[PDB]
Amino acid sequence: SHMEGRLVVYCSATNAMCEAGTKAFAEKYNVNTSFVRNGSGSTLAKIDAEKNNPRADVWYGGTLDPQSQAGEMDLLQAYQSPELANIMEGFRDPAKRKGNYSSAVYMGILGFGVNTERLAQKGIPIPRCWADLTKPEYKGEIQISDPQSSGTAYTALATFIQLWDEPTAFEYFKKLDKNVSQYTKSGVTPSRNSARGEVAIGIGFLHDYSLEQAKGAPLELISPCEGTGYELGGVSIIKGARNLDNAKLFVDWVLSKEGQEVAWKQGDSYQILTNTQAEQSPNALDPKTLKLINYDMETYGSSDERKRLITKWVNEIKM
Numbered sequence: 001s002h003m004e005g006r007l008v009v010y011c012s013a014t015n016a017m018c019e020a021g022t023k024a025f026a027e028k029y030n031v032n033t034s035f036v037r038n039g040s041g042s043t044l045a046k047i048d049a050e051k052n053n054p055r056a057d058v059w060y061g062g063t064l065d066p067q068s069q070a071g072e073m074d075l076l077q078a079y080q081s082p083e084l085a086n087i088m089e090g091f092r093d094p095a096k097r098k099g100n101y102s103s104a105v106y107m108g109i110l111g112f113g114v115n116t117e118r119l120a121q122k123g124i125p126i127p128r129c130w131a132d133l134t135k136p137e138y139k140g141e142i143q144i145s146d147p148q149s150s151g152t153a154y155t156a157l158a159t160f161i162q163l164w165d166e167p168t169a170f171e172y173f174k175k176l177d178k179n180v181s182q183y184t185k186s187g188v189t190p191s192r193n194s195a196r197g198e199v200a201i202g203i204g205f206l207h208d209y210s211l212e213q214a215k216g217a218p219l220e221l222i223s224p225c226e227g228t229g230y231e232l233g234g235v236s237i238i239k240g241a242r243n244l245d246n247a248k249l250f251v252d253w254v255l256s257k258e259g260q261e262v263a264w265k266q267g268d269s270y271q272i273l274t275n276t277q278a279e280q281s282p283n284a285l286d287p288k289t290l291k292l293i294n295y296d297m298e299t300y301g302s303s304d305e306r307k308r309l310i311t312k313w314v315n316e317i318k319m
């Protein structure tokens, strides 16, 4: 019968990570825990819509930029976990509005995955650069997500501006658009469809491609030639949370060694962990071995930039 209260989680990681994380939390603390999974941008919209009568306690996973925007928008309540002492320097309080309205639970590398069987069958060379993806031979063979609803897609747009500049990122996207077969509402979906061979190339976070590989899909991960970007996975307590103590406990736990290791050991989710005492997945990428930009979480997690960039992308690129 009686348990130790409730926790309602709006999750934006994969369903597998969401399920493994909330299950392990629930079983440890005997908390009646539920979750729903939605894209990072979709989740922001939901929390904004529900702000007068909040339905969830915590927002777990997904990219940090929408969570940073929420903090700026007074949709979150700040909570500084003791566990932050164990979080890698530089990642302890990374959002636009400081004071840990949001905290960083993982790091994911942006890139693309390539179905080598499909390209080989079609006599199409494997691409290795972002710039390759605009070439004639990839028309109809690319899937990417939509930054209106997906955190991944916004991370990509932000990464192209930081690799290059804003006009050439948008010029890039105009050319890329001609080759896109589908814009997906969540970030993981291109990994699923490139794995099954419906399209040859998915743009997204590389650990989702590692998982598909591990399941037998003929995928090859590419960290592209020009360099690339990354997400921080966020955790945030929702302002007006009904179950506030269990929310704080959840934040403490998912920032801990124990909570983070559940993601790859039980949730099949191979992001880089931000806790300095956590065992890293042998399947995780090592950032020091990659050409990474220094992603400006503060500017791209600013509300005016999110809205300006996403509006410009819908207007100029998607139409």
Ligand SMILES: O=P(O)(O)OC[C@H]1O[C@H](O)[C@H](O)[C@@H](O)[C@@H]1O
Pocket: 012, 013, 014, 038, 039, 040, 041, 061, 062, 063, 108, 145, 149, 150, 151, 152, 153, 185, 186, 187, 188, 205, 208, 231, 233, 269, 271
């Ligand atoms: O792009 P979204 O739907 O917002 O999801 C973003 C999330 O998607 C993936 O599938 C990754 O496993 C997560 O590392 C990422 O944070």
